[PDB]
From a paper:
Among the neuronal KCNQ channels, KCNQ2 and KCNQ3 form homo- and hetero-tetrameric channels and are responsible for the M-current, which contributes to the stability of the membrane potential. Each KCNQ2 subunit contains six transmembrane segments (S1–S6): S1–S4 form the voltage-sensing domain (VSD) and the S5–S6 constitute the pore domain (PD). The C-terminal domain (CTD), which contains three helices, namely HA, HB, and HC, interacts with the calcium-modulated protein calmodulin (CaM). Here we report cryo-electron microscopy (cryo-EM) structures of human KCNQ2-CaM in complex with three activators, namely the antiepileptic drug cannabidiol (CBD), the lipid phosphatidylinositol 4,5-bisphosphate (PIP2), and HN37 (pynegabine), an antiepileptic drug in the clinical trial, in an either closed or open conformation.
Residue numbers in the entry:
A (entry chain A), B (entry chain G), C (entry chain D), D (entry chain B): 70 to 184, 195 to 367, 537 to 595
E (entry chain H), F (entry chain E), G (entry chain F), H (entry chain C): 6 to 148
Amino acid sequence: RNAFYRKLQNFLYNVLERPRGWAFIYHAYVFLLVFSCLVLSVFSTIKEYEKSSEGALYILEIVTIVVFGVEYFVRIWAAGCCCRYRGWRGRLKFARKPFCVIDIMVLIASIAVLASALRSLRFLQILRMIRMDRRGGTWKLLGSVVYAHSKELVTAWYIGFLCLILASFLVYLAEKGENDHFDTYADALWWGLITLTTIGYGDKYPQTWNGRLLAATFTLIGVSFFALPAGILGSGFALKVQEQHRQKHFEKRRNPAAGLIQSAWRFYATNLSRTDLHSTWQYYERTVKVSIRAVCVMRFLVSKRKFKESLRPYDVMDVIEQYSAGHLDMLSRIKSLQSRVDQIVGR
Amino acid sequence: RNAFYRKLQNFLYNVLERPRGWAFIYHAYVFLLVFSCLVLSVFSTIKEYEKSSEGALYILEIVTIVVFGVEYFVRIWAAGCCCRYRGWRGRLKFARKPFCVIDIMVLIASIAVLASALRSLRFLQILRMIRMDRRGGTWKLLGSVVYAHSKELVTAWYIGFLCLILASFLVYLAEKGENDHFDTYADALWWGLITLTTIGYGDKYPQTWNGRLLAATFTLIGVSFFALPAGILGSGFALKVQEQHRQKHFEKRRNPAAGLIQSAWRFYATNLSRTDLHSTWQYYERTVKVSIRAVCVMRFLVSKRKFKESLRPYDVMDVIEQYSAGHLDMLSRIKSLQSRVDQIVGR
Amino acid sequence: RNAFYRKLQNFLYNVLERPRGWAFIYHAYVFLLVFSCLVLSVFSTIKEYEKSSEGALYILEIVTIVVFGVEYFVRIWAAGCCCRYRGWRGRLKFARKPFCVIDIMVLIASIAVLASALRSLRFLQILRMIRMDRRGGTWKLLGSVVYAHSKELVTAWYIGFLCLILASFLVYLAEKGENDHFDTYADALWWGLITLTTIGYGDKYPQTWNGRLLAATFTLIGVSFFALPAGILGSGFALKVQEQHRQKHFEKRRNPAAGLIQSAWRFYATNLSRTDLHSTWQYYERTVKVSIRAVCVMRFLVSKRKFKESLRPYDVMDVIEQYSAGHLDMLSRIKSLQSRVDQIVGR
Amino acid sequence: RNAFYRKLQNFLYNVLERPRGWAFIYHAYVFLLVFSCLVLSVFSTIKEYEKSSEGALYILEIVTIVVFGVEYFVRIWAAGCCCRYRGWRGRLKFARKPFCVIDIMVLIASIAVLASALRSLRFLQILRMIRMDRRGGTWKLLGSVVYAHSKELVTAWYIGFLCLILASFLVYLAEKGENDHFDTYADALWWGLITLTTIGYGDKYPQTWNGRLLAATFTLIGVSFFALPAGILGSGFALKVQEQHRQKHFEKRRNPAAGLIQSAWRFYATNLSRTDLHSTWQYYERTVKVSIRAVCVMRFLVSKRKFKESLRPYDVMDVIEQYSAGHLDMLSRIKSLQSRVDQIVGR
Amino acid sequence: TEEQIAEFKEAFSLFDKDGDGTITTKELGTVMRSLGQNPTEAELQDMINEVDADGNGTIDFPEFLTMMARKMKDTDSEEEIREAFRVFDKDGNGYISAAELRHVMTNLGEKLTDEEVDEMIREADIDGDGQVNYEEFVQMMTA
Amino acid sequence: TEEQIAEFKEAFSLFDKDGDGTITTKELGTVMRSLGQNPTEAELQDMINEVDADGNGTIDFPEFLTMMARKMKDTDSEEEIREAFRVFDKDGNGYISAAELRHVMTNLGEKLTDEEVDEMIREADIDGDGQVNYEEFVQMMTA
Amino acid sequence: TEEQIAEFKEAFSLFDKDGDGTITTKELGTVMRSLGQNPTEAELQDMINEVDADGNGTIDFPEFLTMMARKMKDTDSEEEIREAFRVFDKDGNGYISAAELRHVMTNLGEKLTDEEVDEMIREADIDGDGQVNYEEFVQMMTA
Amino acid sequence: TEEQIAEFKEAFSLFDKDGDGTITTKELGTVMRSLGQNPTEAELQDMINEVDADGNGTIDFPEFLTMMARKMKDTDSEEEIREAFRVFDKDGNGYISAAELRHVMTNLGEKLTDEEVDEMIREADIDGDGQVNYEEFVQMMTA
């Protein structure tokens, strides 16, 4: 039953490694588990709830370490689906990958803790919380969107910081004397940060007419400037999603891909990797060894380069390049028609 | 006056069932009624206003049950506008629809209540508050937009949660001793959630120099990260409505629809459902039984599939497909012209 | 000096009535003036600042009434630029316009006040505050954008209201016993509205573990749902601005307008309004009475109809319509060319 | 070793003056330096931390003045990379530029301070805070985006201000009697500004039933209206950066640029600036003086005008312009083809 | 019934020309030409793709029986015809005039004769007042 | 008055050629050719669509009376001509030079002779300083 | 090894026709024509761009030796072929049918014969069950 | 100086052919044809638009005197040439190779010979290290 063995192995690799659809369900559950433990840990910091929270946390940590260990083992087992991660050496190389190393390290640390370590318990919780990404996908996406909007974000933060400084200084001047909230400029800066960010604790607020007038004038501006970065980033995220949708609907790379696969197989067949390769040689000789190899490698090169050129179809460039080609072809067609009709008339 | 009967029936079905324009007015009024009732119930939870609020609530619930009952009766009557819902069986099938069942259930429950049930009174109020959707339209729209931006929303929430955890821990370390607000890590987490969400009750806030410094550093980041999901979803909603506007303005499928209507009527005419169908048979015999039936069904199927193909004209796909067709037509035209002029030269 | 008279008259009408560029400066100043008065009124409500605020407010009221009266007089004078409003009857007809009526009645009411009425004065300031729009432009823009996003806004508000109700009820259940903040369900609803809106007064907040846990779970959802409408409307406003930019860049209607003006002048010349019209009669007699009149009026009307049909070329309508026309024209060209070459072969 | 001299000079000018890539790192460090100084100054306003903060601030100011002086000197030296800013005159002309003057005067003022001036110390700190813009880039970007969305921003602020006034007045009427928070209309206005901006200090909040009811009705509207400007500006920023990405990817002006450079050199060669120029004269005499000068000048001028005309390639202007050109030249193509086929038939 | 099965077999045999146990593209082409309409090779390919599911290039007898055995309701074309009528519902209220129906169908696409269109209008409208309700018409036909 | 009614009846009769009580497309084309402007089939289709309202394919006498009896105070063309000018208002202030008016009048669209365009400019500008205000130019006659 | 170096030198010499110490565009063209395929000047310029790196216009012997010394391991095309197979992975799970492989292989671009695509499917799919794992095939060989 | 005034007067006189006091389009066309470059009507119109400001259609002597007597700094072409470089500044750092300068100069638009491109490369780059600086060249050429 090797077929069923490999089918189940590939299915397990798919569900554990990059999941597509309902596989996420499993991951969600795992997350919940970890999350639950984290919450329990918080409840154990409170003295009143220490008993029950720790009682539940012991069981939950046993359960989560069991689950993580079995997941790690079955993941290293399912790694055989990938040809690179095959056998002793392949699976050891998989385990060498840094994130699997971190996983096993956290597992062993938790097992040792269960065999003043509560601080290490929560630290392991946050580490396995960071572990859920495994790719930096969230970090990479945030970084790309921030970099694309770096100038706008910097404008927002810079002007908001200037507004905060100015408003804090002016309200401080207004309120330094007759308001114990604004005793020093540091207190005014704290108030301005808590106000323009819209947090507004209420521990400090202007109480004079000067302070309230200046705060009213500066609030309408500062709150907007401090809320700007969130709006910029959200709109950027939405626009990026829209453009990705358009591009994925405009992949239009089937022909280059098929040509690439054809030429790659041809190059392998011409290559001496296997001594049983003779059918390709018969096919090439029927259409009339090293020269055949060279021409086939050349065809593979051109197919690869065409695939690379077509590997960047974006929403707006596609139509523009298509119309450029169309209009130059139109001009060539009209000039050719003029030449041909002139030749006809010459008769 | 059966014509007026059916006209009024159709109008009532339109206004009560799926509304287009001013019909919403009626629904709005109904909503207000229910909303008013809900508000009154809240006023009845307060002991001081219990007397007057309950006095008004009795009248308002009599009114709302009368209105809902008459609306239910007239809706079941007006379902005759749909041929699927005609007669005894049609009306009964209509009433079996889950939301009509919920409507009658709420009506009966409220009537029974009127003939410690105030909690059930407000529960029926919230149930009939959910009832106003009748389609899940709001839920479906929110789910679709969330799924489209699922990765960005997850990135925002994940990074914001990491920021919350880190800021809470660091401010707790800063303030554990010199501030009774941050007695335990749970208090710090509560503070961080309340400030990064920008709620800022003020029940907890840092009061030390290092605590305030760390809170200031982490606020500019956390507030933006927690406001991100709202911006992402709002921008996604706006972009979705924009693209829907463009697509509805780019329907451009009238010809396939007309072909479908023609083919459907022709196929029915060939269909043996009625023995009075001879005009189409005469037309077919002039254009020269079972073979005609089959060819008519074939025409109807091709019309159906062409309508299916042309049933997804989007803002960007249509232009690209049209230009691909134009460019291939241009190339075929030029090659055909070259062949024809070559043939002319051959003369 | 009638030329300079009418030039200054037109300039004053432009600056006072619809302004384009630096004219806004003047309006801003006027706004500032009235705004200042409003602020002064707010300062006069405070008993401590009654003396100084009233002293300044008397002068400011005199100044603003002088300015508004002279502006009204010069506006009615300069309305002669619009030939609809010329002479006794024209200026009276303009003054009959409802908004000028509002202006004059505000002027008269304030003059009478200057000749317990301070509340009436504040009502006058708010009325002349509404007066600045003069068109409903802000209201019209907001209404259009809200209507375009009515479904998304309703989804946001409906789901946010459901979340508010549920969170308030659950936190009330958590906190009813051991928190005087949540004494009744009305208090819980007030708390939920204040926190989900992110206002967070701090007058009420959960203090139990159940209440804080439930509030933490529900806040990440409710704050986003209540911030959604702002994001939706802002993104809609920005997208509308971008589309308007593109469309105004896509006017491209000079030829229909020129044809319309030509036909209008032709009709007026052939129109029997004036007996001195002979140049156009000579032109039409040389190009070979009532028939020419009718045909020229028809030319004017058809030019008007073309003016209306193409009056609104949109960002995406123009390109798609032009390409559809070009493609069908190309098909006609190729079929005609094939027919012509076939005819040539037939020779 | 002049080659390495000028290479290092250009590199230093690039890193200090307009930076492209990793150069920003250096600037960031400088910013941190000044920022640190600023923070230290705040810590020196507090009496408790005055000693240590001032001790560190002395060293930090020595360091920052040293760094700014050396940076100024090396920037002025590296200005020789630009031919305009070369030699004594070019160096002085650079130093005349306003921001260089600001830098030198800040350096001198700080040196004098180091040789009740702490207020001037912090003023210099904010000035050098503003300094690293050097272009108004943030201000220019904000101004452009605000102007583009000026009407929408004004609508948002105007309707939000009307909502604030109305809500404040109504809640004041509700709460004037039995809530010391709302003693005067100014207190109500302060409460409304704090609530609608979502700051929510909690120093004032309605406590009556009608006051809370009105506040609840008006908050859902006012908070959205006051959050609108942030969303509008953020979405505008995101759309602007998206279109800038598209346009920068659609530069497509190589041919006009090359023609401009070629004709510019041609004009210079024909011009009598240098008498050693004879290769261009030989080329022009072989292709058969003052007449050649004028004709080459006109070639250069037409190249400049074509460059200017093509200097505005935009995301949508290019495609529509090229399609209009294609349509008109295809009309000419078809009419010419019709004429030619008619001529062929004539034979 | 057995009689209907025999009729369908006779229809298949009439479609069959060479007698290979199936229906080929050219058989459909020639029968269509006999009807009067000149077919196209791409149109025959569309024919086969619509009917043939196994992808063998021909139409067999059981596939024909299954194809024609589906009636208006079983076709599951409800949404198709509803949206087809919606596309021409300019106002969207749910009414279409008889004159517009004629001017649409009798001049474009699969054009009909006057008799067919007036019969359609009569059948769709039970009341028979010149106003057509597309939902009512399709439901009574395809539901 | 009755004199104008008789004049319009004579105009209709001159429009009529065969004398069927109405004006057909061919009659309008023939009179246009007599004037000098060669008609077009699309132009005649536009003629019929513009004039007739009941959808009969011909032009009637009462229809022509209603058409020609509407003056610029009843044409509702105030905003229309305003927008027509505004498309050519490059600055948007509301002024156009006389030379530009002559160019647009005699070069683009339905060209006229110099005298007619000079008369148009003179009538548009009461002051006659070469500056035209479209407000007045559409309000003192076209309103 | 020396034997393979001599073999590649003989291959170059056969490639060389005039004997200029390099391979020119026309030599590429004639060898393609001898193979049977008709080349194009555009294809020749593509070849020159692909192989030559010094921008001289021809292909020399050391470049040929180095290029043939590189196998799949020395091309870093793992992602390239991965995405190439991904484009035709309609579901994205990682499975593609053998029939579709045969259809695409022998009817698109540089088409191959049916037997060669059967060999390709056999080699790529170790189990030979008709379901080819793209990652398996692109990792066993290309990596 | 009066010598240059006389030289420009002689240049204008040679420019004029019929001798109407101005330069017509046909004179420019024929002088261009004698020069070697074939003119185009669109090119003639573009040059005329470049010259005239009063809108007459000819070229008068004072305009030729005034415009030809200005130095590179009198046209504010600095930003124009800077952008011209920028378009071909692929990296944006501010450096380009001399080989690409020769390729672009003598292969695009108004091409020149090798000697002229070498001369401009030498003049633009004082150090003569091949790495030409755009800002220096434009500054000592235009500014």
